[PDB]
Structures are given as structure tokens and as C-alpha cells.
Amino acid sequence: IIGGEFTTIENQPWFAAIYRRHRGGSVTYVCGGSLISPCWVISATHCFIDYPKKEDYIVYLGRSRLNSNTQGEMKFEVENLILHKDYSADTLAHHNDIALLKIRSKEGRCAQPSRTIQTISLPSMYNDPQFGTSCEITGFGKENSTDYLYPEQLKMTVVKLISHRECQQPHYYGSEVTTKMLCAADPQWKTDSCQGDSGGPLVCSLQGRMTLTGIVSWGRGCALKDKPGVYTRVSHFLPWIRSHTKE
Numbered sequence: 087i088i089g090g091e092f093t094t095i096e097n098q099p100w101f102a103a104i105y106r107r108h109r110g111g112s113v114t115y116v117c118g119g120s121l122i123s124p125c126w127v128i129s130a131t132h133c134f135i136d137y138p139k140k141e142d143y144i145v146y147l148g149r150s151r152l153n154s155n156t157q158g159e160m161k162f163e164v165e166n167l168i169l170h171k172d173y174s175a176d177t178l179a180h181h182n183d184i185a186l187l188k189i190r191s192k193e194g195r196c197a198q199p200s201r202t203i204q205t206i207s208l209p210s211m212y213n214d215p216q217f218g219t220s221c222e223i224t225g226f227g228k229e230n231s232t233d234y235l236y237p238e239q240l241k242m243t244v245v246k247l248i249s250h251r252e253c254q255q256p257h258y259y260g261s262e263v264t265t266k267m268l269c270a271a272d273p274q275w276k277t278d279s280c281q282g283d284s285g286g287p288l289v290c291s292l293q294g295r296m297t298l299t300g301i302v303s304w305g306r307g308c309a310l311k312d313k314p315g316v317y318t319r320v321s322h323f324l325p326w327i328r329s330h331t332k333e
């Protein structure tokens with residue numbers, strides 16, 4: 087997250103931190119995610135596409151820090167890793183960048199709600215906030231494009247939804263952005279999501295309710311003028327979500 091402010095898991099109870107174990111013994115952060123139900127976390131496919139081995143991932147809920155423990159946090163293994171079959175990456179755009187991870191503790195249980203662990207509601211069929219609406223993003227992503235390390239404390243910021251019409255302009259992203267995507271940015275181009283924030287949630291208050299409107303996916307640079315962050319439009323994948331989370 088470029089700019090923005092540091093926060094705690096208490097204020098983002100649905101945020102999931104996903105790590106990958108290495109042959110040696112080191113565990114590195116991979117991507118963010120969101121708990122949409124006790125046993126399911128939603129994230130982005132590009133995060134796991136090169137290493138689709140479910141056994142090498144660890145999911146943390148109720149965690150505020152990157153490399154240290156938080157009281158109340160819960161550790162989970164990945165029972166099932168579901169990547170989208172039509173995922174593909176072009177020059178800039180990442181298509182169908184969404185994924186599902188069925189989690190389970192070592193005892194075989196799913197998440198237990200608490201003050202630091204809660205689910206986030208999914209949107210309704212083709213029911214997104216109006217463009218211009220302010221939404222929040224959260225992540226352990228880079229604070230600056232030139233950094234090679236991630237912040238130790240979780241961060242959050244607020245950006246505004248941009249219409250497809252504006253985002254499809256020549257100086258923006260042209261035809262690379264489709265209707266299955268959502269653009270969002272800071273009108274001043276000072277705050278934005280960045281590398282390491284992938285998979286995280288773009289949350290918007292929709293009719294009084296906190297809704298998982300987008301998933302951090304891609305963008306040209308970070309906090310660059312006329313280069314909004316692009317998010318997977320969750321409201322367009324409800325069918326895919328429901329069909330895979332059944333049985």
C-alpha cells in the first residue's frame with residue numbers, strides 16, 4: 087500500500103495472510119485474501135499459478151504483522167486450491183484473476199469467528215457501487231515502488247471507483263481493461279495498492295453493508311498518474327464462486 091495508514095487486523099477482520107513454505111524451512115509472504123465464509127478464503131490466481139501445490143501454503147487469519155505473531159491469530163493449511171481455468175496474462179491485463187482456498191486447521195476445523203476474525207459479505211449479481219464511490223484496500227504490500235521489502239505492519243487506504251469509460255481512455259489502459267474488471271484510484275494519485283497487495287480485498291460500503299467488491303490484481307507501476315489499480319470484479323464471478331464452494 088502506497089501512502090495510507092497503518093492499521094490492525096481488528097479493523098480488517100476478514101483479511102487473510104497467505105504464505106508459502108520453502109524446501110529449506112523459510113516461509114515467505116505471497117498474497118492477501120479475504121474470508122468469505124468459515125472454510126473459504128478468496129484470493130487471486132496469479133498468486134499461485136506458478137506453484138499450484140496446496141501443501142506448500144499457510145493461511146493466517148487474525149494476523150496484524152508480517153513476520154511476528156498476534157494473539158488470537160489462527161493458522162490454517164490449504165485443503166483445496168482452486169484456480170480459475172481461464173486465467174491468462176497479457177501485456178498488462180490479468181484475466182479471471184481469482185482463486186479460492188478451502189482452509190482447515192490441524193484439527194480439521196475451519197475458522198472460528200472472533201473480534202479479529204470475521205467474514206466479509208459477497209456482492210449481489212451485477213450490483214456494484216456507483217463510480218466515484220470510496221472504498222478501502224488492505225495489504226502487506228510495498229510502500230514504495232523502489233522497496234524490495236514489505237512493511238511489517240498491515241496497512242490500509244481509501245481509493246475511489248473509476249468508470250469503465252474513463253479507465254478505457256487512451257492515456258489510461260485503453261481496451262486492455264474489460265467489464266470483468268474495476269479500476270480504482272486516488273484522485274490525487276498519491277495512494278494506491280502495489281506489489282504484495284495482490285489477492286487482497288477492495289471493500290466498499292454498499293447500501294450500509296461492507297461488501298467485497300474487488301480483488302487486488304494488477305496495474306502499471308504504483309500510484310502513477312492516469313494508471314489506476316485494476317481489480318477483479320467479484321460481482322461477475324458469483325456463479326463460479328458458488329459452483330466451486332459447494333462440494
Ligand SMILES: N=C(N)c1ccc(CNC(=O)[C@H](CO)NC(=O)[C@@H](CO)NS(=O)(=O)Cc2ccccc2)cc1
Nearest residue numbers: 178231279280281284303304305306307308309314315
Ligand atoms: N494499483 C496498482 N498500481 C497495482 C500495481 C501492481 C499490483 C500487483 N500485481 C502485479 O504486480 C501483477 C503481477 O504480479 N503484474 C502487473 O500488474 C503488471 C502488468 O501485468 N504491471 S507492473 O509491472 O507495472 C507491476 C509493478 C512492477 C514493479 C513496480 C510496481 C508495479 C497491484 C496493484
